[PDB]
């Protein structure tokens, strides 16, 4: 994997050299193409460089990270229009990219945690250096301190594990199992905030709402997934303690799911709908994951990947409106079918994927997760039905009201659809259809 790492480092200079926004973009896609070629892994750790490995679980996560990290540059061009320090933007993105690769490939838990929490900074740059709302300040406070206030405490659990174990490679922990009843909460809850959990969803709507197209795409596209990837690696040894205290987590996730869907119905902001929607889906992922059954886990991996893709594309849609009609509101945005009908196609498709319409790697997830939960406890079905029902419900409302009603009277002439955005929407969705042909690499990792 050092091949990728050195490639990114040698891409860093382009940020300094003037007028390299598009040259950087093609390179990031090109290396993604290279990283695609490198694919032979099994469940065992593979490509063991000095301390960097790669695996089913890490391989797809990295590909999504490289994928989304290149799509940033397609998404954001107003930075170039404004000349709003394009150099700092490009440097921030690449720095973030390297951290993600090193986070997902750190074969040590401590190396993993180190890059995991190192990512706190570059994301904060991305919101703050290019935010729009005055809330951008307090939002950054929410994001950083919700994370650090629990992300720091696992640092003790990591060192405690060292003392009782002698290392932090993932295979080594798996050999052992811990049941001290604080190790469990300290690690679990610390990941749950970044997951996030319904009770600590609070920050996430704020972070997305007052963040640029780019930052929001990052926030919903990796950060939530990165929390989950840690879970998949770490719960190997939390089993007994998890079994004793698991009903609480699955309950709040499932209960919170129907609630947050009803929040979506009543919500009146494009980013707020998607933000709450993304929390809902990651609620079900957290559920299947905490089931720990084979079906749950192998499906969780899939739903994280698919959810990240759909959430990004929906954010590009939200950016499109925000960049034409200059206001996030449901009320102002309406009837866009009359102004960008070929775009409303993509609005429908990305909405479709978020409500689990096939052929859709998202959908492939819920079959796996729903099978797991139902097996785990028949009682779940009474809320699983409503959870999916209201899932599709708000997505319908989002698609219709935004695109259907009669136009808005006060709307000042704005340019029409353009190749950058069109290609951006295809690129997020079409792979989301591609993968089903070869889900086995994205479906089997245990």
């Amino acid at each position: 994997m050092l091949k990728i790492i050195f490639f990114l480092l040698f891409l860093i200079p382009f940020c300094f050299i003037n007028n390299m926004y598009w040259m950087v973009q093609i390179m990031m896609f090109f290396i993604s193409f290279i990283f695609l070629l490198m694919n032979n892994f099994m469940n065992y750790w593979s490509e063991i460089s000095y301390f960097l490995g790669c695996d089913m679980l890490s391989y797809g996560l990295i590909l999504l990270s490289l994928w989304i990290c290149s799509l940033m540059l397609l998404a954001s061009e107003m930075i170039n229009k404004h000349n709003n320090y394009k150099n700092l933007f490009l440097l921030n993105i690449i720095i973030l990219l390297l951290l993600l690769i090193l986070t997902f490939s750190s074969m040590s838990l401590f190396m993993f945690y180190l890059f995991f929490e190192s990512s706190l900074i570059p994301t904060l740059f991305l919101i703050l250096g290019w935010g729009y709302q005055p809330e951008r300040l307090q939002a950054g406070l929410y994001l950083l301190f919700y994370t650090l206030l629990v992300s720091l405490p696992m640092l003790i659990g990591i060192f405690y594990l060292m003392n009782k174990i002698g290392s932090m490679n993932f295979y080594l922990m798996n050999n052992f199992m811990f049941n001290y009843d604080l190790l469990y909460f300290c690690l679990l809850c610390a990941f749950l905030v970044k997951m996030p959990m319904f009770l600590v969803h609070l920050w996430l709507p704020k972070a997305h709402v007052e963040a640029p197209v780019s930052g929001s795409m990052i926030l919903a596209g990796i950060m939530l997934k990165l929390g989950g990837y840690g879970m998949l690696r770490v719960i190997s040894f939390l089993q007994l303690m998890n079994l004793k205290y698991s009903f609480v987590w699955i309950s709040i996730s499932l209960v919170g799911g129907v609630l947050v869907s009803l929040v979506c119905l009543r919500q009146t902001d494009l980013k707020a709908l998607i933000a709450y929607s993304s929390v809902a889906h990651m609620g079900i992922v957290l559920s299947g994951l905490l089931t720990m059954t084979y079906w749950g886990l192998c499906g969780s991996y899939t739903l994280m990947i698919a959810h990240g893709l759909c959430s990004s594309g929906l954010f590009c849609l939200a950016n499109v409106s925000y960049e034409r009609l200059g206001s996030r509101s449901m009320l102002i945005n309406k009837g866009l079918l009359n102004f960008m009908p070929s775009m409303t196609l993509w609005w429908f498709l990305l909405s479709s994927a978020n409500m689990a319409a096939p052929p859709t790697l998202n959908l492939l997830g819920e079959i796996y997760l729903l099978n797991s939960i139902v097996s785990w406890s028949w009682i779940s079905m009474i809320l699983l039905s409503f959870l999916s029902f209201f899932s599709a419900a708000y997505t319908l409302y989002l698609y219709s009201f935004s695109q259907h009603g009669k136009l808005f009277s006060g709307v000042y002439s704005f340019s029409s659809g353009k190749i950058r955005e069109y290609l951006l929407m295809l690129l997020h969705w079409l792979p989301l259809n591609l993968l089903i042909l070869k889900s086995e690499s994205f479906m089997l990792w245990l």
């Binding site: 000095y50 301390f51 040590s108 401590f110 190396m111 932090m168």
Partner: protein
């Protein structure tokens, strides 16, 4: 008695004398067999094992 008054300081000098009691206390050194040892300069130092033996060898 025809004795002579000693010098101004005849008793001020040292008195080196013969031994009659013949009881010199014994000159001795203490022995703590279990004192705390360190690493002698002759103890072989094989070059390090497993780098710095730290998290990722570094």
């Amino acid at each position: 008695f025809d004795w002579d008054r000693p010098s101004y300081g005849y008793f001020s000098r040292a008195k080196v004398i013969q031994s009659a009691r013949e009881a010199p206390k014994k000159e001795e050194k203490v022995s703590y067999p279990d004192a705390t040892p360190g690493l002698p300069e002759d103890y072989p130092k094989p070059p390090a094992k497993y780098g710095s033996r730290f998290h990722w060898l570094e």
